[PDB]
Design a protein around this ligand. Structure first.
Ligand code: ADP
Ligand code: ADP
Ligand code: ADP
Ligand code: MG
Ligand code: MG
Ligand code: MG
Lengths: 370, 156, 370, 370
């Protein structure tokens, strides 16, 4: 009788029960398969590991992400991820709880349709729903007006909402997020002689990026400071005890969000994308969109990203405007918190896609109910 | 639940083994550790039949694959402990915390495999309850003492 | 119905029954043939002696080892060794017991193929299997993770195993073991005027090495100590009552394991080989490989080899690492103990090479079953 | 007044004069040091040999490569290599000729900086430059568009260039090249009983690989053919007259380029890497990249590597595409030929790093001039 809320990100699964204030399962959205020779009898029967199971044993596994850029690419590994989520992590029976799922905007329709079908036919959920992650972030922030920038492992999206009305023509999606920054950091770590190639070493580099990287308020003076001194250099100890030092890779990696040309993309930075999304909205709502810049997702968790974000948008916007960037401390789970707010809402209970409706109208019911 | 009580009493044994590792527990030296290894291996074989039955009452392309994987791990760990304890017993009889480390490591491995087998068995029984055969086992997802998972910390 | 476990080393045969905790036959792997004039009638009919039979009479025999460096070189003498093992030492009928055999890694394929053929066609074993000796050592040590350094009469090998998965690209074999140290000790015993040339005198020198030699924790201070004093000199009584004294040959002979250049080899010491094998493994398993350095074989039985081993690997590895050398008191039989653990395993009983499979697929079945 | 062109590979030094069409010095990039006892007076004064000097005497030397994987690891031996190149092989005075040097992409910056410093301060070159080897290969091939797959002793790299513009985000480097194949061949030669351990025997195995190995167009049918018959077996005579025979080691060793998992690497084969590099490029240049697959370096000199290369990329690419693999007969020197084309260019003469600029800006001038 209590709904489930599974936030399937590209990088992490955030799962829990509607009504709660925090997910109960947060594990990597990876499936690992052994890549070496099993030489002991019975030690190689398990052919696949999911979640923290795979990060624990990643030294003998090949780690694969079922989701790239917010689109599910492996539907047998994602199916394993969902089975893990329901049975090993949450330990529920899916056919008694309605499940709320999340999806990025401007995403293929087959993604949503196959999620609907997998739920209703492999997990027999009584009902389900697919919600847009930026609307859920605005739910969690306690607002009904504001432009939400959500950055995850796979996609960065801006959705401007005013008085509960979205402006879908001003929604901007950008396939540049945490995994692209991890790849860029692996690339520019080679300048110091550090070679991380394996998927496990990619997880190591993701850890380095989360612990050491930050966003420079002014990039050029930070480059000058790093060149002049060694005050910005920090060390990091690898899983086998080697120590690496990185000086300007710390703020060069997150700068790819504001200069996507670092990784060869032609698009505009997240500040320019946010401004361009605000200026596709009606002139009468732009003032309230400027003052409510909700940032959610884990790629917005760099130290200094809100200050740089506000500086850049202030440069772009008129000088009489009211630029505020809203970055809650818990914004790494804003999508899940908003999903649990919505799934527990009393007025939402007629908005589930029941299995009767699915049986009438096939998986295509999800484009018209959601 | 037979599975839960068997695994949890083995956890009591494995706690006493770690307590000997810390140097302050109900075991004085290697001989007590050898005896504890023997009984934990016996209880592991009992656990092995419990897993066998739960697997045999399960559909083929189901959670029984993981369960059989963990059961094979259990088989090897129990066998390693029984021969290694016999080897350590002979070595003591002929001639050692360092010696205790191999048995304690095998016991840690066995206990980890048993925890994995417990959760796999619970998933197999819950997911396929009113499939025939599982009802005869009478393991209705309540005999399992499964806590609700605790919430994550929002800020770290 | 009970399997046999024959550990064919270069120096010793360790044979017994699976399930037991110790071999029942441990005899030298030699075949001796008389080299003098038989002058009494009927006293020279026996033309060949095997095992302790040959060491007893070695004063009139020429002793030959069928195995050098882990490769069987004489297939008629090795065949005699196996006949002795089965019929005189173990006293079984080979065609009722499956036989587990052991072999070093990176060894010629014809060795394993001809072992399979000899078993199935001369001894009619119902089934057989060839296992790697380092995996068996890890079985006997009660672990599924760790790097095993195994030293025998013929070969020293490192096999890193993590969670039951071997990393075959990091396996290192080194043709330097007990027989090379025996030869080096015969060579450097001539500096004191002791000349041991015959094969029997080589057995005498092997005894001297086993009784008197040890591994110096720091070689240069031990050389200085031996030069300054006579505290390290020990005596040894030869089979005819002469007494020899050796001062620094005691720790110079085992030092060839850490300085292979003593015998003119270009390779690296066993510490350097162990470290190099650990650093060919994935970075995430190196910490657990450092902490589980299983040492097996009889050449690892020198007093002080584990202390020197740990000192050298600690020097090589990072300072935050967890270097432990695991040297069980019974490690001279770790390969056999692990072989009896494996051959008695319940999950192993479908992994024998049955004689039906051999009849289908020739001796080449052993590369794909093992 | 004539520039020098030194192509410092991991395996060979290719040195000569700009404008020429072939290097004048091509010698192994090794430094050998005696490892035995000098017993004749005056015969042991020379403590180090470089190049063909060391291969001639390698039977009493320990051969070391200053470069592994394209990074210079020994800066005193590499310095000897350069002194040899300038004074004994080319017989020039370095302070009158500008020197063009080559380097792999995604390589540590300290490598390039220390090369700049060594040139300008030990050899006093009037100017120098460091060029990327794949750009030089494209120069030598007479094109300005195409993706270059350059494989040497140490590194395999893919650089896609279109109309003279490189796409640095699509550059792929893979630390798998000729030396890894030589090591793999030493490893799998032990299956036949051939043990090559010394560094000199590694040179012998490199010769075996160059003479006998080839790339199978279809690996599985070649394995079946080698198993069924003995038509693929070829002999080779060792330096002391022993003859070895290898049947499927001939095409198993080069297969590690297309199945890097043979040596335990997780990366993708060179065909998959080439395709992945093409698909990181803009969709409008992919057609021209497919049709110009320039292969340079000596590891691309296996018989049949271009046919297999085209078969695999044709399998990966769409069926309407224009897959051509360009493998010039002289591609073992494409990097040097392109370097001599560039260093002789009239428009290049303002692009040297003069010693005035070095004196102004330290070794860091090389990242902004090159
Ligand atoms: N403290 C941090 N600093 C920078 N990046 C972070 C931090 N924590 C997480 N990330 C990045 O955020 C991504 C996960 O964020 P999340 O919102 O969970 O993604 P998704 O919605 O795709 O699951 C990961 O790629 C990780 O690299
Ligand atoms: N106490 C000892 N000290 C040093 N070396 C020993 C000792 N005991 C045996 N050895 C050496 O170990 C070798 C035999 O070891 P073992 O593991 O049985 O070899 P294999 O596996 O080849 O049979 C012999 O060469 C012997 O010289
Ligand atoms: N005919 C050949 N067949 C296969 N490999 C070759 C051949 N000739 C040379 N090689 C390999 O190419 C490597 C040298 O190529 P090169 O391009 O000179 O390397 P580098 O750029 O590192 O100097 C050597 O490792 C050698 O093993
Ligand atoms: Mg998200
Ligand atoms: Mg042995
Ligand atoms: Mg080259």
């Amino acid at each position: 009788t209590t709904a489930l809320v599974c936030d399937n990100g590209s990088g992490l699964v955030k799962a829990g029960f509607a009504g709660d204030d925090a997910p109960r399962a947060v594990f990597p959205s990876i499936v690992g398969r052994p890549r070496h020779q099993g030489v002991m009898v019975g030690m190689g029967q398990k052919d696949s590991y999911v979640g923290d199971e795979a990060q624990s044993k990643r030294g003998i596994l090949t780690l694969k992400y079922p989701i790239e850029h917010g689109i599910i690419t492996n539907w047998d590994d994602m199916e394993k991820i969902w089975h893990h989520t329901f049975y090993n992590e949450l330990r529920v029976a899916p056919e008694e709880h309605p499940t709320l799922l999340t999806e990025a905007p401007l995403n293929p329709k087959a993604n949503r349709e196959k999620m609907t079908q997998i739920m209703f036919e492999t997990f027999n959920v009584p009902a389900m729903y697919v919600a847009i992650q930026a609307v859920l972030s605005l739910y969690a922030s306690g607002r009904t007006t504001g432009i939400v920038l959500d950055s995850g492992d796979g996609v960065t999206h801006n959705v401007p909402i005013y008085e509960g009305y979205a402006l879908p023509h001003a929604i901007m999606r950008l396939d540049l997020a945490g995994r692209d920054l991890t790849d860029y950091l692996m690339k520019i770590l080679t300048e110091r002689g550090y070679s991380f190639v394996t998927t496990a070493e990619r997880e190591i580099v993701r850890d380095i990026k989360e612990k050491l990287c930050y966003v420079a308020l002014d990039f050029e003076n930070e480059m000058a400071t790093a060149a002049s001194s060694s005050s910005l250099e920090k060390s990091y100890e690898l899983p086998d005890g080697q120590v690496i030092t990185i000086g300007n890779e710390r703020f060069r990696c997150p700068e790819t969000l504001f200069q996507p040309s670092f990784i060869g993309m032609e698009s505009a930075g997240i500040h320019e994308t946010t401004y361009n999304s605000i200026m596709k909205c009606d002139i009468d709502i732009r003032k309230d969109l400027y003052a409510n810049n909700v940032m959610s997702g884990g790629t917005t968790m760099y130290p200094g990203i809100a200050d740089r974000m506000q500086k850049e948008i202030t440069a772009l916007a008129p000088s009489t405007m009211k630029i505020k960037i809203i970055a809650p401390p818990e914004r790494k789970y804003s999508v899940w918190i908003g999903g649990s707010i919505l799934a527990s809402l009393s007025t939402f209970q007629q908005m589930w896609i029941t299995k009767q409706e699915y049986d009438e109208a096939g998986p295509s019911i999800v484009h018209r109910k959601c | 639940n037979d599975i839960i009580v068997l695994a949890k009493q083995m956890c009591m044994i494995m706690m006493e083994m770690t307590d000997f590792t810390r140097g302050k527990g109900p075991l004085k030296n290697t001989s007590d550790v050898i005896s504890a290894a023997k009984k934990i291996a016996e209880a592991g074989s009992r656990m092995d039949k419990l897993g066998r039955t739960i697997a045999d009452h399960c559909p083929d392309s189901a959670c029984k694959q993981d369960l059989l994987a963990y059961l094979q791990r259990i088989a090897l760990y129990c066998h390693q402990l029984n021969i290694c304890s016999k080897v350590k017993a002979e070595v003591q009889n002929l001639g050692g915390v360092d010696s205790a480390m191999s048995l304690i490591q095998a016991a840690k491995n066995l206990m980890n495999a048993v925890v994995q087998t417990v959760k796999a068995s619970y998933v197999a029984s819950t997911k396929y309850q009113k499939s025939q055969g599982m009802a005869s086992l009478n393991l209705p997802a309540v005999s399992w003492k499964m806590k609700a998972p605790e919430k994550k910390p929002l800020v770290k």
